[PDB]
Every structure is written in C-alpha cells, then in structure tokens.
Structure 1
Amino acid sequence: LAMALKRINKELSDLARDPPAQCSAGPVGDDMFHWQATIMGPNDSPYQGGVFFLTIHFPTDYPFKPPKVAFTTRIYHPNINSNGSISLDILRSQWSPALTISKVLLSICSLLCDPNPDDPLVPEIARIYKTDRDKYNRISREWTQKYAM
C-alpha cells in the first residue's frame, strides 16, 4: 500500500511546484487517498467565470487503476450528471499509469469547452445541445451563475 502512497505524493509535489493556471487539486486531512480538485470553466464557454469542485478518490492499487473523479458542484453539461459522475474514457477504459491526475483535470476542462453529445450520460440535455445551442448556453450559463459563483 505504500506503492501508491509514494505515487500520489509524487503527483502532489508535481502539481504543487507547477500548477495548471485553470486547475488545482490536493488532499484533505492527513488522508492522501481522498483529494479535492477545482476546475474553473474556460473563457470561451458558458461555464466561463464559474468555479467547479470535484472529489478525486484514489484506489489502493493506483496507478494500476484509474481514480474516481466526480463533480461536487452542479453543472448543466451533457457528460456529467446529478450523481456528479463524469463520463470520460480515461477514467473508465483508457486509463494508464503514464496518466496524471492533472491530465484528467485537463481532459475534464476540454469536455466543458468541447462537449461530446454522442456519449450522453444525460440524454435530455444532449437533445438540447444538438437542437438549440442558444437554449443550451443560456441554461448552462444560468447554472454556472447559480451553483458555481
């Protein structure tokens, strides 16, 4: 079990020294397996300005499994749900040790900036993304302002 506890401490000392401008993550308490992260919506999106929290729950055999990453903060997006659960290949099938928890965050950034409706975790919103962006945007913007500011 120290194998992962050595790995994570790496990834934290990485993110500490050189953070991403639009992301941030770290543990709470002396526990190093439960993290908290924040993405801030990108400046070419309805999610702009708003600040979204996530929880990263690492496994005991990390990096040989993916982490459980999910949004604590409400977001009206096609690929994310009320549970909080993201759908993102790299958390499910395409996971590798090479992959940092950062690159997950980065990928969650792009997901917001460049949302994919063909892998719909929430078909209701997916209907609306594909038939009326103005409606999608106005809402996904209103939700950003209510729940993420």
Structure 2
Amino acid sequence: MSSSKRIAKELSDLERDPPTSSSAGPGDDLYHWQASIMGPADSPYAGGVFFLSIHFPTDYPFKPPKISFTTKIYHPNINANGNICLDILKDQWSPALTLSKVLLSISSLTDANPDDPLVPEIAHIYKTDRPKYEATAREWTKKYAV
C-alpha cells in the first residue's frame, strides 16, 4: 500500500546524482540490495572495496534496515556478522534519512567509537595498539577486500 514506492525513488536518486565512493541498488528482489564502499585512503582499509548484503524491513522508511557484511574486516565496532554500531539506526532513526545518508554514515566507518566495543579485543588495541591495529587491518584488507 505504501511500502515499495519509496525504494524506487531512493534508488533513482543514484541515477540522478551518483555517489562519490559508493553505489547501491538490488539481484531482482526489491528488498534485497547489494551496496558498495571503498576503504578510505586515510585509513588502514585503503586498498579495500567491500561487498554488502542488504535486506529491507517491513518498512524501510519507518524502520531501520538491518545490514550485514560479506567481506571480513578487523575493526572494533564490527564483528564477523557485519553488525554495524551506527547509532543513527537504533536511536535517532528518522524517516527522512535516505539510504544514501545511511551509506554516508557507514562511510564514516574510519572514525571508531571506543565506547561501543563490539569486539573488545580490537577495541583495546584501538585504545593502545594503533600501529598493529593499522597493520592487521590492511593485512585483512589484502586478504579479503581485494
């Protein structure tokens, strides 16, 4: 009744204005998307392009879409299940936040949030052991995100 027509326009906003470091869109399912993001140059992820699995909820506008990773990463706010410690989706999820805006907030992840230690072993390393953190992040970058 209302669910689908938002998605088409949010997708066509890509055709009207392509993004800088990302891309979006579906296979054939409307609610099954596959996003894109490339590791920032000013970050150990550099040299990494990521594969994303997206399933929209019953309401993409009225509810935050759960997002999972396909490519393994070495980051505190990310586990092996691709769970994203983005504070927008669960706390300040506005209906007006576009999928592009959500992709931008993902691209903000880079800036790690230490108070959310999804993997505390990596969180403490970010707290004190940034050198090996940066080395191993690029290690896994070249391992998975070619």
Do they superpose with TM above 0.5?
yes
TM-score, length of structure 1 as denominator length: 0.93
Quote the sequence identity (%): 75
Alpha-carbon shift at residue 37 of structure 1 (Å): 0.4
Alpha-carbon shift at residue 125 of structure 1 (Å): 0.3
Q: Which runs of 5+ in 1 are unaligned?
A: none
Kindly report structure 1 stretches of 4+ aligned residues shifted beyond 3 Å.
none
Within 5 Å, give how 1:27-42 maps onto structure 2: 27-29=26-28, 31-42=29-40
3-state DSSP class of the match of 2:25?
strand
3-state DSSP class of the match of 2:138?
helix
Q: Which runs of 5+ in 2 are unaligned?
A: none
How many residues end up aligned between the 2 structures? 146
| Partner of residue 138, structure 1 | 135
| Partner of residue 44, structure 2 | 46
| Partner of residue 120, structure 2 | 123
| Partner of residue 86, structure 1 | 84
- For the 8 Å contact 1:69–1:91, the answer to whether it is kept is no
The amino acid of 1:7's aligned partner reads R
| Partner of residue 64, structure 2 | 66
- 1:96 paired residue among 94, 97, 101: 94
Post-superposition Cα deviations, 1:10-53, rounded to whole Å, max 9, x if no partner, equal 10000222121101111111x11110001111110000121011
Taking only aligned residues, the RMSD between alpha carbons, in angstroms, comes to: 1.1
TM-score, length of structure 2 as denominator length: 0.95
3-state DSSP class of the match of 1:56?
strand
Name the structure where helix makes up a greater proportion of residues.
1
| Partner of residue 12, structure 2 | 13
Matches of 2:58 and 2:40, distance apart in 1: 33
